[PDB]
């Protein structure tokens, strides 16, 4: 009886009537079984959404948007509140100055998009988009926690909703969240929106220009366990496109300290990292020097053992820092003073794979440039080692072509070959009629260094002669005319030695 | 040189 006649009063003509009706109906919603009557019944549910829509005074509104707001607490009441057209309506909504009125349609909308199907589609349509966003600048901590939550259900695994929040000016939005309140609760949600953009390759620039590499570092220390990990995979994700950045002598300092955890998580992430903002960087790589990064890094490939996800990282931050730079010869000869050496060549030996050999190859390379470890590198027996690798290499993979690990394997032993006791222990491996072969090779790099090597060994009669009777005559007149500078300028001094 | 390393292609 009651139903049939509250629709009806619900759109007359004259308000007072619809005004006051709404007032009603809206009493009845809190109660159960009134609810239930109210759901089952597909015109009452209609005619309350036109009305929070067309109204045009204040409680009317307030009363309509808090009656939908309790049918969506079940899901009888959600697919009513759906089939009758009610989320076009509720986003037009988000535009109102009223609080009330504002913070339930956001709730009811929230809702729907976790437990509705078809929600998302719709939501997209009215364009709940560009309105969230512009929200972001109230000052409702709460408010702010639950608009945020609903940015992400959206965003995740559609491209077209990245680009429009990215259009709309998210990214400098979100990062100032991050560096003025301190709710948690907000600071976490708000972190998983900025996750969820840091995987495409065009949002990702947008970030790291507002400042969002210093905003994240600020809650690397706090309490919270959730809000420390998201922060990290979000620093590892945009850490690619943030190497030319100015001011970051802050965050490395952290960075550095966090290498030290009971986390293995966290030092995984904080590895990695250091590896990527270390790149060509010479004011990166100097700071990280003084605050003792070479001693700290060190030591993190000792613990990690065999598990390639912390030492591949670890070891390619190692090789930026010894090169480039004021302070190259203080970090190749820091590794030496720190026990370092020993760890450095064992990696080379299996269980190990191709990407993580590759790296060490290129750290000996550099470490070999400074006097005081030639002796070291020796006796810790890399040479036989180096050979031996160069070897199956040669012939012949799990994403490393094999003339790189030669035209490196080659290179390691040109700079060692500068003491004459690695040249007598080289030499005696019968490695003379190979490091002739290569100079038939169509890549000039692996010219210069073949041709380098064997112009360090034969300034020794014995050697010298060995090499011109296996005919290294015939190739070497030939690399003479190259215009490479470089491999023609040691074509000359091995023929000029052996002669 | 220095080569960077796009970790969101690798997790």
Redesign the interface.
């Known amino acids: 009886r009651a139903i049939p006649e509250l629709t009806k009063l619900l759109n007359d003509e004259d308000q007072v009537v619809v005004n006051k009706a709404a007032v009603m109906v809206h009493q009845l919603s809190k109660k159960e079984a009134s609810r239930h009557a109210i759901m089952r019944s597909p015109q009452m549910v209609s005619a309350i959404v036109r009305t929070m829509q067309n109204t045009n005074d204040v409680e009317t509104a307030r009363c309509t948007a808090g009656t939908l707001h309790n049918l969506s607490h079940h899901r009888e009441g959600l697919l009513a509140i759906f089939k009758s057209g009610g989320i076009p309506a509720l986003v037009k909504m988000l535009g109102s100055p009223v609080d009330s009125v504002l913070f339930y349609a956001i709730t009811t909308l929230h809702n729907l998009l976790l437990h509705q199907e078809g929600a998302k589609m719709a939501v997209r349509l009215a364009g709940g988009l560009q309105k969230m966003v512009a929200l972001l600048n109230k000052t409702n901590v709460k408010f702010l926690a639950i608009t945020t939550d609903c940015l992400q259900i959206l965003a995740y695994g559609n491209q077209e909703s990245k680009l429009i929040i990215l259009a709309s000016g998210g990214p400098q939005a979100l990062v100032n969240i991050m560096r003025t309140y301190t709710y948690e609760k907000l600071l976490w949600t708000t972190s998983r929106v900025l996750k969820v953009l840091?995987?495409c390759?065009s949002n990702?620039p947008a970030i790291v220009e507002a400042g969002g590499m210093q905003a994240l570092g600020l809650h690397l220390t706090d309490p919270s366990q959730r809000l420390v990990q998201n922060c990290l995979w979000t620093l590892?994700?945009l850490?690619?496109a943030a190497?030319k950045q100015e001011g970051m002598e802050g965050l490395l300092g952290t960075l550095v300290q966090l290498l030290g955890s009971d986390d293995i998580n966290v030092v995984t992430c904080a590895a990695?990292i250091l590896?990527?903002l270390?790149?060509?960087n010479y004011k990166n790589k100097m700071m990280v020097c003084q605050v003792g990064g070479i001693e700290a890094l060190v030591r993190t490939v000792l613990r990690a053992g065999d598990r390639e996800d912390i030492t591949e990282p670890a070891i390619?931050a190692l090789r930026?820092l010894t090169?480039?730079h004021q302070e190259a010869e203080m970090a190749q000869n820091a590794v030496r003073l720190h026990y370092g050496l020993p760890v450095v060549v064992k990696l080379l030996h299996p269980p190990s794979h191709w990407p993580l050999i590759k790296a060490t190859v290129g750290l000996i390379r550099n470490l070999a440039l400074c006097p005081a470890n030639h002796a070291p590198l020796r006796e810790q027996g890399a040479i036989p080692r180096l050979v031996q690798l160069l070897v199956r290499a040669h012939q012949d993979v799990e994403g490393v072509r094999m003339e790189e690990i030669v035209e490196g394997c080659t290179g390691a032993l040109h700079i060692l070959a500068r003491d004459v006791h690695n040249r007598i222990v080289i030499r005696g491996l019968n490695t003379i009629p190979l490091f002739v072969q290569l100079l038939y090779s169509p890549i000039e790099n692996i010219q210069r260094v073949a041709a380098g090597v064997l112009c360090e060994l034969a300034q020794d009669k014995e050697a010298a002669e060995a090499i011109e009777a296996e005919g290294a005559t015939a190739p070497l007149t030939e690399l003479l005319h190259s215009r490479n500078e470089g491999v023609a300028t040691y074509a000359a001094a091995v023929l000029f030695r052996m002669s | 040189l220095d080569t960077p390393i796009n970790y969101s292609l690798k997790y």
């Open positions: 840091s995987v390759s990702k590892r994700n850490s690619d190497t990695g590896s990527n270390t790149c060509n390619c930026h090169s480039r």
